[PDB]
Amino acid sequence: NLNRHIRMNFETFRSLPTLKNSIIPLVATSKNFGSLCTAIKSCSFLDIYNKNQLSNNLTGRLQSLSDLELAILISAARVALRAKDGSFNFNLAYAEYEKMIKAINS
Amino acid sequence: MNVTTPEVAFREYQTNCLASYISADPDITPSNLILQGYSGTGKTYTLKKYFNANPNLHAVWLEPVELVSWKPLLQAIARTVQYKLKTLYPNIPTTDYDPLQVEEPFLLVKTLHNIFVQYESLQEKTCLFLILDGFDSLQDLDAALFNKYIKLNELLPKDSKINIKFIYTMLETSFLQRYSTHCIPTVMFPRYNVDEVSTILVMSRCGELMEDSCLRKRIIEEQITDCTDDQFQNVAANFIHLIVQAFHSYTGNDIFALNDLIDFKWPKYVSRITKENIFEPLALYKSAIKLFLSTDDNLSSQTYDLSIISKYLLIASYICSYLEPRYDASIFSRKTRIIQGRAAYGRRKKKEVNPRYLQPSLFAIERLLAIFQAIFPIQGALREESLMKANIEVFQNLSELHTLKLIATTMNKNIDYLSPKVRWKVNVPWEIIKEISESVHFNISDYFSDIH
Amino acid sequence: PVIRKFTKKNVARAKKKYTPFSKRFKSIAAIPDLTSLPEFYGNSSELMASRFENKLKTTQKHQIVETIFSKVKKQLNSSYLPARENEFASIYLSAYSAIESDSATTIYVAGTPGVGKTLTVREVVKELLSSSAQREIPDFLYVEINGLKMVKPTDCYETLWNKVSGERLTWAASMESLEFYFKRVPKNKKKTIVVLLDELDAMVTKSQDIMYNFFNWTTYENAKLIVIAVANTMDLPERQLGNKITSRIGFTRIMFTGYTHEELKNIIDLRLKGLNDSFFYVDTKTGNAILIDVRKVRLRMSADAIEIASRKVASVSGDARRALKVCKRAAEIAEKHYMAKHGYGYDGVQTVHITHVMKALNETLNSHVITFMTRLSFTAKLFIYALLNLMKKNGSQEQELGDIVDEIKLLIEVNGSNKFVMEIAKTLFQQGSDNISEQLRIISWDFVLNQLLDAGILFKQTMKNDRICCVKLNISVEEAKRAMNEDETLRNL
Numbered sequence A: 001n002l003n004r005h006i007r008m009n010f011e012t013f014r015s016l017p018t019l020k021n022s023i024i025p026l027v028a029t030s031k032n033f034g035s036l037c038t039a040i041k042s043c044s045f046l047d048i049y050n051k052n053q054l055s056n057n058l059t060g061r062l063q064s065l066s067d068l069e070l071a072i073l074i075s076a077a078r079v080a081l082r083a084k085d086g087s088f089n090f091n092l093a094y095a096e097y098e099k100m101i102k103a104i105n106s
Numbered sequence B: 001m002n003v004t005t006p007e008v009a010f011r012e013y014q015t016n017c018l019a020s021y022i023s024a025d026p027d028i029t030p031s032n033l034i035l036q037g038y039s040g041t042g043k044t045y046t047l048k049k050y051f052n053a054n055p056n057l058h059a060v061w062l063e064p065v066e067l068v069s070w071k072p073l074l075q076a077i078a079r080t081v082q083y084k085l086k087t088l089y090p091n092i093p094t095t096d097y098d099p100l101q102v103e104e105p106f107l108l109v110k111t112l113h114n115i116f117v118q119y120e121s122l123q124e125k126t127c128l129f130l131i132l133d134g135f136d137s138l139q140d141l142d143a144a145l146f147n148k149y150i151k152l153n154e155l156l157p158k159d160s161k162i163n164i165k166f167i168y169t170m171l172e173t174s175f176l177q178r179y180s181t182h183c184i185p186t187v188m189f190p191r192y193n194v195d196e197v198s199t200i201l202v203m204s205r206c207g208e209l210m211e212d213s214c215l216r217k218r219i220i221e222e223q224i225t226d227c228t229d230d231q232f233q234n235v236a237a238n239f240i241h242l243i244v245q246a247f248h249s250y251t252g253n254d255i256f257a258l259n260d261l262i263d264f265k266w267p268k269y270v271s272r273i274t275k276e277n278i279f280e281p282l283a284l285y286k287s288a289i290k291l292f293l294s295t296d297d298n299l300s301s302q303t304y305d306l307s308i309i310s311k312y313l314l315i316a317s318y319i320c321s322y323l324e325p326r327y328d329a330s331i332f333s334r335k336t337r338i339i340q341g342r343a344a345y346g347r348r349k350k351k352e353v354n355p356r357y358l359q360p361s362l363f364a365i366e367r368l369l370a371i372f373q374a375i376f377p378i379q380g381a382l383r384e385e386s387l388m389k390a391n392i393e394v395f396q397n398l399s400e401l402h403t404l405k406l407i408a409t410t411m412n413k414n415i416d417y418l419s420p421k422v423r424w425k426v427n428v429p430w431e432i433i434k435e436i437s438e439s440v441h442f443n444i445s446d447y448f449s450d451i452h
Numbered sequence C: 001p002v003i004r005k006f007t008k009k010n011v012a013r014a015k016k017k018y019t020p021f022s023k024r025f026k027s028i029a030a031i032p033d034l035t036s037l038p039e040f041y042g043n044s045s046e047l048m049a050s051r052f053e054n055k056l057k058t059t060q061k062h063q064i065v066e067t068i069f070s071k072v073k074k075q076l077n078s079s080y081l082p083a084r085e086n087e088f089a090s091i092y093l094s095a096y097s098a099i100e101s102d103s104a105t106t107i108y109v110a111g112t113p114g115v116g117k118t119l120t121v122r123e124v125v126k127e128l129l130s131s132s133a134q135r136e137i138p139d140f141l142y143v144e145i146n147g148l149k150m151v152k153p154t155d156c157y158e159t160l161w162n163k164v165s166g167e168r169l170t171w172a173a174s175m176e177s178l179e180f181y182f183k184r185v186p187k188n189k190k191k192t193i194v195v196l197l198d199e200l201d202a203m204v205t206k207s208q209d210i211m212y213n214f215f216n217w218t219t220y221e222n223a224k225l226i227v228i229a230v231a232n233t234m235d236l237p238e239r240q241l242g243n244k245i246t247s248r249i250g251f252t253r254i255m256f257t258g259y260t261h262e263e264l265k266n267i268i269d270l271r272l273k274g275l276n277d278s279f280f281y282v283d284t285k286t287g288n289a290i291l292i293d294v295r296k297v298r299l300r301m302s303a304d305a306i307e308i309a310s311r312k313v314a315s316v317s318g319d320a321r322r323a324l325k326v327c328k329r330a331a332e333i334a335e336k337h338y339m340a341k342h343g344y345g346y347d348g349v350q351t352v353h354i355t356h357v358m359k360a361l362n363e364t365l366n367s368h369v370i371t372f373m374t375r376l377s378f379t380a381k382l383f384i385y386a387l388l389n390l391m392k393k394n395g396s397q398e399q400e401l402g403d404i405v406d407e408i409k410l411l412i413e414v415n416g417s418n419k420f421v422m423e424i425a426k427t428l429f430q431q432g433s434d435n436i437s438e439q440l441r442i443i444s445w446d447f448v449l450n451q452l453l454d455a456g457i458l459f460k461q462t463m464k465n466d467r468i469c470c471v472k473l474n475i476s477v478e479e480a481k482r483a484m485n486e487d488e489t490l491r492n493l
């Protein structure tokens, strides 16, 4: 696993300090030597940490959107997709939210 | 290390990855540490819980939202570091330097160096944790200020006894994606879950609802003796779950937009328990269904306290900045001709793009004055000439509307009103124009009937 | 007492007087003889610079070790000559016919940087000081005004009046003092002064008043100054000075042209006359060479190496400093080879040749951007490949970022056959693990934006929308094409 994470670090950001910031909370959160040994055997932290580094960019916080907010975002992207240069406003967005939801209740 | 990890209820990765980066030995500690999150995502709570669980290491709490530009930030850093050291190691001769002497980043470096080289009389090297809570919440912020705080430990001396270790706190994630090649340890804080918000609110709020005397006077106003502490906390948690499942689609995953809804709708919910609504969960919700359908957050009869000619000026400016200028001699021209002429035919096809969704148009003041005396009601036996002309009062009310930011214009800086190149526009929405036209009883719904 | 709106706690003011030279005596008929005054013209307390001298000297200790090539690397530093004769003679005659005739001339030299103009001007002034010591002429006080050695471009007045008079005023009092001293004081009580205006095109600021005054004090009959102003472009008063000040500067305009390969070969010959083909008594134990265990060693700084170092630098810009930098880098390369081959360390004959100086001639003709974009990451090369093949479709050089994103996604989805890209397209979007959803951007996207933004390959415009932020290739497109053709995977992908 350690060589595989180094191999995917070599194709992504090709840098040793990113590996250092990966390895440091692995060595520092461990409590016993056998725990550190299996933690660097499995690399049970270089996917916990590496999941958390992407936890809110444009996908891990769209995952935490609510339902009305998602319908508003979908309608706004529809309105911008329909326009020429991609601009819209709150009136053009709400004139797609009620139209979509009336077609849902239809 | 010897740090104590706190028992924060729903940030379990973050306190472990926070005790792996904050220690009392300055060698096993990074020189910069970002805690990027969003609003309400638990940054300050878990930071204060960590630093209170570890009393031995030293914190400097600094919030760059009440320190607007960068110069009070440098002055506040140089002030509070010295004030923290004065109350930490008191028996050292501490010559007070003025924090107002700091005017540039270099003078912050020089001042902090002169502060630190007078504490060489210690025994072992320590770190001081300067926390910039809300570094993206700086008001007059630029993209190159953060480079001046990354490369500050490059200037403080290496064989010194007090080393500055920063802990930032960001909020925006397009700010942080500029300082990505600097490879600072970033501990990201993802947005809370509905299952986690619904119990964060319970563990935060159900102490200050049983200790809220509007209920503890209701239990004796209603002669309620079938109660215990469970019989209070269950209706408290049930009310909080009711606000959650009622209003989560409204707010989102924000603790702050739920805290104030709970603060608003609590005594109007205690005023609906009578004698046995505390035992059941459903007929109490059916006794207070009115405060779980609509949010009721606004600050609430009439619409505007304006004159009659100013209301008709607002209506006429709303008309001429949404109507195309060619089609007005079909809508307003009404008087009998004496000479051979033809009126405007009007638009053939109704355009269904609904122009009153957009930004308005720009008109000359003669078109506003012409549409103003067309839509004006009759006033005032052949020397009256009842069609009202624009006297002083019309121009004065028009300038009052421009002052009140209701009609507006192309804001060039200190524009002249008396130019034939300055055009005007309305910046009030439709939803107040309908109330205005309802107030003066003007049929304006059939003015935009040929669009939708 | 008072509450102030802001503070200026860190303020430092000099100790400089405000009343000029015009209000010393207020008597033009009773001005004393300014030449043999105690304070004027540097006659008193001229230790005013040598206060800081015994600070940068510590221990005279520990037996520093020279080598066989440390001598040449010392003789190739900043220091008749067969280089400038027709300029030296004309400048010294044009500045001698005013010293002898009590005149007020102005000489104008110019040239691209390195052609020895400040060296010949300072040698002209040294020779005229020798003539003053031989007393065939009167004496002068020498003032060098460097255009870039001052924090304010109006401090020329302060340093000129300070050098003339021993008193320091502010700049307004100094310009009024110098105006009075160069207009009204008669030519019996002033000895002449020569002014070197080093790097003139850095005091043209906002009024052209300094350029006015230093060339309009020389149109006076009663002012004995000679301005020998140097420049960095021949047509400077036709570009950035007024036509009246062009008429002030006049018609002399002696250009210092570039050097030739013969002149440069003679220059390096005179620099190494004392060391080439001579004999040194080195020691096997350390390497400490001493010119006239012990080994008598020659030193052949070969003439073919000198002339092949000289022909290229004579072509490009012709600088007698860049020739010394080339021939010092050659000696550095030789010393490094010598020390690594012998294990000497700091505390047969030796040669410098053609295939040894070609490294010093090739160290400045390498674009280390191709050997940078080859060693770049795979995602950064994929970024550059998406930007490069969007250009043939668009024709703008200024592609958006939302387009680069969808082009990267297009390449990854349309190559679903290659074993390399199916191994890498899992990690490229999910960091090789589950419990990570498929991200919209690839992993390391802001990283490989910033790693090219800071390096100057990439060029992004500032905006808040990272779908319509335009992005330009700041280096080139041809070198990106020649750097994307050695990957073995992007050559087909």
Ligand SMILES: Nc1ncnc2c1ncn2[C@@H]1O[C@H](COP(=O)(O)OP(=O)(O)OP(O)(O)=S)[C@@H](O)[C@H]1O
Pocket (backbone or CB within 6 Å): B008, B009, B010, B011, B037, B038, B039, B040, B041, B042, B043, B044, B045, B046, B171, B200, B203, B204, B255
């Ligand atoms: N895990 C938790 N356990 C208990 N209470 C919590 C928890 N998370 C949040 N809270 C409460 O909700 C509040 C959230 O505020 P903060 O923790 O300061 O979040 P925040 O990110 O600092 O907000 P900003 O960034 O200053 S706008 C805390 O003050 C607590 O009252």
Ligand SMILES: Nc1ncnc2c1ncn2[C@@H]1O[C@H](COP(=O)(O)OP(=O)(O)OP(O)(O)=S)[C@@H](O)[C@H]1O
Pocket (backbone or CB within 6 Å): C077, C078, C079, C081, C083, C084, C112, C113, C114, C115, C116, C117, C118, C119, C120, C199, C230, C267, C320, C321, C324
């Ligand atoms: N004929 C020469 N003989 C010896 N040294 C020379 C000669 N020509 C140029 N140099 C070198 O150039 C230096 C003198 O500076 P110059 O090049 O004359 O000033 P410049 O030409 O004005 O350059 P700039 O642009 O002002 S930095 C000396 O240190 C010499 O090493």
Ligand SMILES: [Mg+2]
Pocket (backbone or CB within 6 Å): B043, B044, B133, B134
């Ligand atoms: Mg906070």
Ligand SMILES: [Mg+2]
Pocket (backbone or CB within 6 Å): C118, C198
């Ligand atoms: Mg020079």
